[PDB]
């Protein structure tokens, strides 16, 4: 049965991940963005004021892909 369960779980995973992608795409499009890399210090503000950081949101996209 394990092959059947894997077959269900793969399509299930794409469907939930694809819902999450749509939610993230709306959430990123509606908001203002800031971009940074691994050379960040311990904690500091970025050049624009009041922006929201979502780089882990799109790094999770790469990792899941």
């Amino acid at each position: 049965p394990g092959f059947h369960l894997n077959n269900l779980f793969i399509q299930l995973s794409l469907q939930m991940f694809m819902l999450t992608l749509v939610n993230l795409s709306s959430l990123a499009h509606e908001s203002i963005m800031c971009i940074y890399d691994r050379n960040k210090p311990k904690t500091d503000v970025l050049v624009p004021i009041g922006c929201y950081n979502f780089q882990p949101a799109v790094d999770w996209v790469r990792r899941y892909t």
Binding site: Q15, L19, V22, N23, S26, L27, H29, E30, S31
Partner: protein, 64 residues
């Protein structure tokens, strides 16, 4: 009977997914990127229900 309440369980997974879209459609209409105007009201739910019901009503009238 227990079977009757038991049968309708299968609908809870695919219904949630519907709400999963319903939020994603409202958020863009929320205009949160620009400074939101206060105490102004607007809606899209009626648009959604008429979209979901009108083709069904048209088909039912055709059947009639």
């Amino acid at each position: 009977a227990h079977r009757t309440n038991l049968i309708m369980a299968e609908i809870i997974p695919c219904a949630i997914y519907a709400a999963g879209c319903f939020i994603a459609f409202t958020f863009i209409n929320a205009q949160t990127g620009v400074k939101t105007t206060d105490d102004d009201r607007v809606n899209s739910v009626l648009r959604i229900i008429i979209c979901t019901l009108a083709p069904i009503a048209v088909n039912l009238g055709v059947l009639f």
